[PDB]
Ligand binder design. Structure first.
Ligand code: HG
Ligand code: HG
Lengths: 281, 290
């Protein structure tokens, strides 16, 4: 949704665009550099770690700076496309037998840029990212649960999270072939995957808060499964371990885990309902 | 449920108005003070997030129209020119959300899709005519203060509410601005965004683009000489364009974010799938299946 006007949010100097235009062959490389800087800036903004309410203003601030320089380039493209169109028209009046087609705005690419513009755009995004990093440092000093873990601390926290998720996966495997509870199992798996992130680049458990909320989210997701199927949550669930329980690689192990898990559900009482993370009802 | 559609638990049901609601009423100015774009908690409880499971990705918006049905744009599920063709197992819907950067365990509901139904006469190779699709949830989801269905209009509501100048509301987590190269990427919000816009006269919609528009679409947006701005953008597709009826105080989904050229460009308007025009199909689907 577009609601704001970012047209006066650029730090590029009004006169920079009237300087010396750079040779087209060198231009292309400067535009790709700019594109890359924006990508990198937006990527820092999106980092999972910063998806906490306390970074809201630091982020809005950085976003406003990135969109502002983006808008600068977008408006420059618009102005130049208009001039291009009139040039194309003139070219046609001079080579009437030409078959070349006028580029659309979306095919067009910026043809004019000066080093002053490139340097100012570049410096502006750099300064914006720097301010963002300072705002972040300040934020994290006044909220210890947001402070990044050391690598050892992160490894330990990440293992607790992964272990809980693997218990969730066991429950999922124990009921994915049960006609009565299949949908609940499938959603459990899908929800556990969603909070963890892509297997190849999962959300890092980088501070006390993420460790704490990820654990509660995982516990709640498992409890959602039992609440919805009407089954009782066992106190003991063997954590799923691919090397020991893979459905295809270790059928026996897989079947033993399913069996052990289904049985523990059967023997569980409903005490667990009085202690759930979420309020049900 | 069906009877209770369009009445928001955290608003109408509590006799509370949201911050811009009044801007949709015939009597209004708008000066100095301009309200924020962040949605108020529970202000679009029919809001749905269409999510790709892997790699994780917020694909499009959608809307809840019953405890078992979700409405969206067909091009979010099927669009050959971008090699897009998702099937039920490729995704999920996230309902009742506010922030998209975290899982919201107390209000959020994740539903597995049982079946997707794309309009058989969805015209993707030409102009997105009939850009609409339905998704049946495997289980009905329970309503709460954050998850409530919107109403679909009938012939007259559409005839009376869809008039040039009348304003509707569009919500979504899509891009905040058009960018200079498609590559720049996505400038996304963490919180549901809202924008209210006026329906514009068909002749202006038609003259604003070279794409062939049909009666199954309508466009909305401010004109060059209107000063206010705003529009839907990449990622918003499938989201609802709603209107509050002065006759019964209920919210009606008049449209579905469908397409546009760029985002918020002067003399350009966002196009929406005309919901009433495609209601017999919606009804046939819901009545035949589940
Ligand atoms: Hg485009
Ligand atoms: Hg376009």
């Amino acid at each position: 949704i577009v609601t704001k006007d970012y047209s006066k949010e650029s730090r590029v100097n009004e006169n920079s665009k009237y300087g010396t235009l750079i040779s087209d062959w060198y231009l292309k490389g400067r535009l790709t550099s700019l594109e890359s800087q924006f990508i990198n800036a937006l990527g820092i903004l999106e980092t999972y770690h910063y998806g906490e309410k306390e970074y809201k203003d630091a982020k809005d601030k950085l976003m406003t700076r990135i969109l502002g320089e983006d808008q600068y380039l977008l408006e420059r493209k618009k102005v130049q496309y208009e001039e291009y169109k009139k040039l194309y028209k003139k070219y046609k009046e001079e080579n009437p037998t030409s078959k070349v087609k006028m580029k659309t705005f979306d095919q067009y690419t910026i043809e004019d840029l000066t080093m002053r513009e490139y340097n100012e755009l570049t410096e502006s995004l750099k300064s914006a990212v720097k301010d963002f990093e300072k705002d972040v440092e300040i934020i994290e000093n006044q909220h210890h649960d947001l402070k990044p873990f050391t690598d050892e601390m992160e490894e330990k926290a990440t293992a607790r999270v992964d272990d809980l998720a693997n218990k969730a996966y066991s429950v999922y495997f124990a009921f994915v072939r049960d006609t009565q509870h299949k949908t609940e199992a499938l959603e459990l798996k899908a929800k556990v995957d969603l909070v963890l992130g892509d297997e190849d680049k999962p959300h890092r458990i980088s501070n006390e808060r993420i460790e704490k909320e990820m654990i509660k989210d995982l516990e709640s997701i498992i409890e959602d499964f039992f609440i919805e199927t009407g089954l009782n949550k066992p106190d003991n669930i063997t954590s799923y371990d691919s090397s020991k329980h893979h459905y295809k690689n270790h059928s026996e192990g897989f079947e033993a885990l399913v069996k052990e898990t289904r049985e523990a559900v059967t023997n569980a009482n409903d005490s667990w309902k009085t202690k759930t993370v979420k309020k049900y009802g | 449920g069906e009877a209770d559609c369009g009445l928001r638990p955290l608003f109408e049901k509590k006799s509370l108005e949201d911050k811009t609601e009044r801007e949709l009423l015939e009597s209004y100015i708008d000066g100095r003070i301009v309200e924020g774009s962040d949605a108020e908690i529970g202000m679009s409880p029919w809001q749905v997030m269409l999510f790709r499971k892997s790699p994780q990705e917020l694909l499009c918006g959608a809307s809840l129209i019953s405890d078992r049905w979700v409405l969206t744009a067909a091009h979010c599920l099927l669009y050959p020119p971008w090699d897009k063709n998702f099937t039920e197992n490729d995704l999920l819907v996230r309902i009742g959300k506010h922030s998209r950067t975290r899982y919201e365990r107390n209000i959020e509901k994740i539903s597995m899709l049982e079946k997707i139904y794309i309009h058989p006469r969805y015209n993707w190779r030409e102009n997105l005519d009939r850009d609409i699709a339905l998704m049946k949830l495997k289980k009905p989801v329970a309503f709460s203060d954050y998850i409530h269905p919107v109403c679909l209009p009938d012939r007259e509501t559409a005839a009376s509410l869809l008039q040039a100048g009348y304003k509707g509301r569009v919500t979504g987590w899509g891009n905040l601005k058009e960018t200079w190269t498609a590559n720049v990427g996505k400038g996304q919000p963490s919180v549901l965004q809202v924008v209210n816009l006026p329906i514009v006269e068909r002749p202006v919609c038609k003259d604003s683009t070279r794409i062939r528009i049909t009666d199954n679409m309508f466009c909305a947006g401010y004109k060059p000489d209107e000063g206010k701005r705003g529009d839907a953008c990449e990622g918003d597709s499938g989201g609802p364009f709603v209107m509050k009826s002065p006759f019964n105080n209920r919210w009606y989904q008049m449209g579905i974010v469908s397409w546009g050229e760029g985002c918020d460009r002067d003399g350009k308007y966002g196009f929406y799938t005309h919901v009433f025009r495609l209601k017999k199909w919606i009804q046939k689907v819901i009545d035949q299946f589940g």
